[PDB]
Amino acid sequence: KTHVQLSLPVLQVRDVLVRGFGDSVEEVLSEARQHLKDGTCGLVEVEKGVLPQLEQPYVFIKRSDAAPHGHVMVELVAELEGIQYGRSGETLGVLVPHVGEIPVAYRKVLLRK
Numbered sequence: 466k467t468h469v470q471l472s473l474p475v476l477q478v479r480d481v482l483v484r485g486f487g488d489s490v491e492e493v494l495s496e497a498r499q500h501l502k503d504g505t506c507g508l509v510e511v512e513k514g515v516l517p518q519l520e521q522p523y524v525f526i527k528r529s530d531a532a533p534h535g536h537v538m539v540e541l542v543a544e545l546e547g548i549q550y551g552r553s554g555e556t557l558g559v560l561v562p563h564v565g566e567i568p569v570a571y572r573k574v575l576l577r578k
Contacts, residue, residue, distance in 0.1 A: 468575045470536050471501060473508040473526075474568035476561065478515045481507070483562040485520030490543040490550045497524040497541055497560050501576055507563035508572050511556050521545050524560040527553030529577055536575040 486496035500506035508526065509515060516523065522545040530538040541560075542551035557572060 467578065468538070469501075469578050470534065471504075471506075471574050471576055472571045473506060473560075473574060474563055474566070475558070475570040475572055476507040476509055476563065476566045476568055478509050478518045480566040481509060481519070481561050482564050482566065484518070485522070486524055486560070486562065487522075490522050490545050493522045493524050494541055494543050494550070496562075498578070500560070500562055501578075505563050507561050507566065507568070508558040509561055510558045516559065519559055519561065525549075525553075526557045526560060526574060526576075527551075528555045528557060529553055533575055534573075536573045538575045538577065540577040 486493040526539040529540040
């Protein structure tokens with residue numbers, strides 16, 4: 466399947482134990498896709514002061530379309546030193562490894578895989 470229905474645990478930035486996926490744009494996109502498939506991926510909603518508390522490169526989920534079965538269609542865009550790799554819509558948040566942090570909510574997405 467080109468798309469997969471996922472329910473992503475929304476984490477508070479100060480709870481996050483592993484604050485990024487790795488050290489290159491290609492590694493963070495790779496690791497993000499692997500964690501999404503393995504159900505070990507969390508989502509941090511972007512506000513003032515969030516991104517400086519997380520590690521670059523960043524992996525964003527961005528709205529790719531205007532929502533099957535409640536699930537917003539999203540794709541991955543990485544960012545390193547103000548340059549993005551990918552072009553997509555509005556940010557739904559930044560992806561991080563999930564290692565058992567208690568979420569505040571769940572975000573239903575349809576991920577272009």
